[PDB]
Amino acid sequence: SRWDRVRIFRAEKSYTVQSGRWYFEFEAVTTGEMRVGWARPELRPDVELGADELAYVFNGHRGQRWHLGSEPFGRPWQSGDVVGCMIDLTENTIIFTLNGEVLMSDSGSETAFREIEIGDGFLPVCSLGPGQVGHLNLGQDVSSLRFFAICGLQEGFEPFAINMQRPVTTWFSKSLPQFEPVPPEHPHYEVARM
Amino acid sequence: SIGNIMNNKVFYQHPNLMRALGMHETVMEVMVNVLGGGETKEIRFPKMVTSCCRFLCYFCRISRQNQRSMFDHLSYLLENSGIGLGMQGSTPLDVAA
Amino acid sequence: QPIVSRARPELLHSHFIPTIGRLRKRAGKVVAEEEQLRLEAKAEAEEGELLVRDEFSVLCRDLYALYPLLIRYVDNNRAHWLTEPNANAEELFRMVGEIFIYWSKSHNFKREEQNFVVQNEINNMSFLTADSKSKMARRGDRYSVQTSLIVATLKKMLPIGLNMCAPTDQDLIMLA
Amino acid sequence: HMADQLTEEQIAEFKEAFSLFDKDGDGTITTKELGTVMRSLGQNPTEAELQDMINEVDADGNGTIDFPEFLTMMARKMKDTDSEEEIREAFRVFDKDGNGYISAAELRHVMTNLGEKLTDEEVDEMIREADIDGDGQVNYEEFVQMMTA
Ligand SMILES: [Ca+2]
Ligand SMILES: [Ca+2]
Ligand SMILES: [Ca+2]
Numbered sequence: 001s002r003w004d005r006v007r008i009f010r011a012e013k014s015y016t017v018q019s020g021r022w023y024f025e026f027e028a029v030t031t032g033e034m035r036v037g038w039a040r041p042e043l044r045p046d047v048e049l050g051a052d053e054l055a056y057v058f059n060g061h062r063g064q065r066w067h068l069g070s071e072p073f074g075r076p077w078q079s080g081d082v083v084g085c086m087i088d089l090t091e092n093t094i095i096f097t098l099n100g101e102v103l104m105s106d107s108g109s110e111t112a113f114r115e116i117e118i119g120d121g122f123l124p125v126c127s128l129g130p131g132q133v134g135h136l137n138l139g140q141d142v143s144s145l146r147f148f149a150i151c152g153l154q155e156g157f158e159p160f161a162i163n164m165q166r167p168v169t170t171w172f173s174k175s176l177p178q179f180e181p182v183p184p185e186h187p188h189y190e191v192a193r194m
Numbered sequence: 195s196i197g198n199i200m201n202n203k204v205f206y207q208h209p210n211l212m213r214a215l216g217m218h219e220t221v222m223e224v225m226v227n228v229l230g231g232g233e234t235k236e237i238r239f240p241k242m243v244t245s246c247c248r249f250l251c252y253f254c255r256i257s258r259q260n261q262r263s264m265f266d267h268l269s270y271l272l273e274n275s276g277i278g279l280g281m282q283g284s285t286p287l288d289v290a291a
Numbered sequence: 292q293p294i295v296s297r298a299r300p301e302l303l304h305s306h307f308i309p310t311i312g313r314l315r316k317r318a319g320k321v322v323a324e325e326e327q328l329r330l331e332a333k334a335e336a337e338e339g340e341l342l343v344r345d346e347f348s349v350l351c352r353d354l355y356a357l358y359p360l361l362i363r364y365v366d367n368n369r370a371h372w373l374t375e376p377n378a379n380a381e382e383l384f385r386m387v388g389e390i391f392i393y394w395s396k397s398h399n400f401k402r403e404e405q406n407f408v409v410q411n412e413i414n415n416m417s418f419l420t421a422d423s424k425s426k427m428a429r430r431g432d433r434y435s436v437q438t439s440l441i442v443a444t445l446k447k448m449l450p451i452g453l454n455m456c457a458p459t460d461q462d463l464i465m466l467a
Numbered sequence: 468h469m470a471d472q473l474t475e476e477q478i479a480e481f482k483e484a485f486s487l488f489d490k491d492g493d494g495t496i497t498t499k500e501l502g503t504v505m506r507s508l509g510q511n512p513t514e515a516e517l518q519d520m521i522n523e524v525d526a527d528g529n530g531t532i533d534f535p536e537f538l539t540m541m542a543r544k545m546k547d548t549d550s551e552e553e554i555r556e557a558f559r560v561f562d563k564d565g566n567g568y569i570s571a572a573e574l575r576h577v578m579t580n581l582g583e584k585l586t587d588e589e590v591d592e593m594i595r596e597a598d599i600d601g602d603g604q605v606n607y608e609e610f611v612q613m614m615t616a
């Protein structure tokens with residue numbers, strides 16, 4: 001079906017960051033359709049990551065960055081490649097690295113996104129397509145990160161969960177249909193109480 | 195006489211000379227004398243009045259110094275423009291404008 | 292540039308360090324002449340200001356004949372240097388750092404470098420994006436300070452320099 | 468004003484042109500007088516359009532064209548030739564040599580002629596602001612979009 005195709009994993013809204021520089025890694029066990037990046041707390045579970053303004057993700061299947069659309073960025077990944085997602089809320093930039101090498105667009109731009117407004121904040125997020133396996137490392141154990149020292153440690157970035165006891169609680173988009181109240185601001189459906 | 199002056203190249207080549215001769219003052223004084231007589235009941239010789247007014251309008255457009263010179267008589271033109279509505283064409287109010 | 296991807300670590304000490312050191316002392320020698328001119332202001336200082344401009348122009352040519360090779364070499368070996376600290380890599384950081392300081396302080400150095408790039412049609416963008424094209428991936432196209440190889444090489448060697456300093460030295464760095 | 472738009476020579480030339488139309492010398496241009504010169508130039512218009520091309524410039528509506536109206540026509544023709552090309556002459560003031568770029572030395576030359584003086588260093592400040600390409604010269608395209616140098 002249309003919905004049992006992409007499964008979105010994100011951190012809990014209580015971990016939203018509105019300042020500082022943060023780093024985490026995503027390992028692509030498979031090479032298919034997987035996206036990883038940063039998302040706002042109001043992220044919608046039934047929308048592909050980056051198809052709207054609520055997520056800034058990098059699609060490593062074919063080397064694309066997604067935010068309100070797709071544009072080429074970087075190179076496609078391989079099995080075992082580690083993607084280092086870096087967000088800088090002091091410069092309002094997002095940087096993606098592949099195996100310690102910073103990905104670049106079709107220009108000298110070393111940053112995937114620029115002039116991003118903080119607003120509510122950002123959360124680490126990833127989406128996996130059908131038959132896709134990925135490893136998310138939020139950096140609770142700094143020694144477990146494989147490319148943080150190579151690119152990210154000297155730039156002032158910190159692991160997303162550097163000082164945390166319990167592992168970061170994650171929420172996933174469950175493809176089980178449920179009945180919910182019709183939103184008062186639904187674009188297509190209106191309910192009038194007569 | 196006005197037509198011959200406006201047909202002369204010197205009138206346009208040397209606006210300062212025309213200003214020195216007091217040509218605009220002389221034409222204005224002739225116009226107001228006609229406007230002064232019969233200032234309320236009837237204006238006679240309308241063709242002369244519209245010829246003098248048209249002359250002064252072209253006089254202003256030659257140079258800004260000519261336009262400034264006619265600006266010094268703005269109040270003088272306005273007080274004679276109350277009955278200028280009767281004449282049609284070029285009027286003292288048009289000269290002030 | 293294509294053949295540097297297979298360079299061995301021995302080239303850092305055998306070739307790159309002696310070559311950059313010669314460029315570093317040449318840069319220091321020219322700026323020493325430049326400051327000599329300004330301390331004694333004279334109508335003759337113009338006759339000699341052109342001399343240092345020529346010296347800066349030839350110097351910028353030498354830097355742009357080695358930095359594109361150095362930049363690619365640094366990219367393929369920066370991970371190893373950060374993983375295991377290297378005395379030679381730290382020494383190279385001082386050399387490129389001092390050249391950058393000379394470039395930042397000297398006004399003619401910036402002018403001659405900009406003239407060299409525009410007059411020789413140096414891309415200054417393929418030198419930084421060749422690795423991305425190698426991996427099968429407007430504003431300042433003619434010249435930009437951001438894409439200058441003198442400052443681009445330093446920014447790629449900056450993590451090596453920061454790796455020397457301990458985290459306890461962050462307060463000292465701010466004071467300095 | 469006519470003095471701004473026209474010089475003494477141009478007024479003399481226009482008067483000769485007006486006298487060429489006015490063969491009578493009475494000081495007014497009639498339809499037949501206007502029609503006669505058109506036939507000498509080859510055109511053979513009708514009186515319907517001949518009156519229209521008179522009323523288009525006849526101010527007082529008397530049906531004839533005198534020298535003040537003739538000069539007013541020519542004054543507009545000289546004035547409306549230039550509409551927004553004033554930036555072209557402004558560009559050439561800074562562009563002494565005649566090419567399509569403004570050099571720092573050329574910017575020094577105009578600044579030298581003007582009252583304000585530069586210390587040979589801030590001249591680079593505004594030229595790099597105007598020059599987006601970074602080649603050290605401000606072209607015509609860069610000048611019109613934003614003017615600082
Ligand atoms: Ca006639
Ligand atoms: Ca007429
Ligand atoms: Ca020029």
Ligand SMILES: [Ca+2]
Nearest residue numbers: 598600604606
């Ligand atoms: Ca330019």
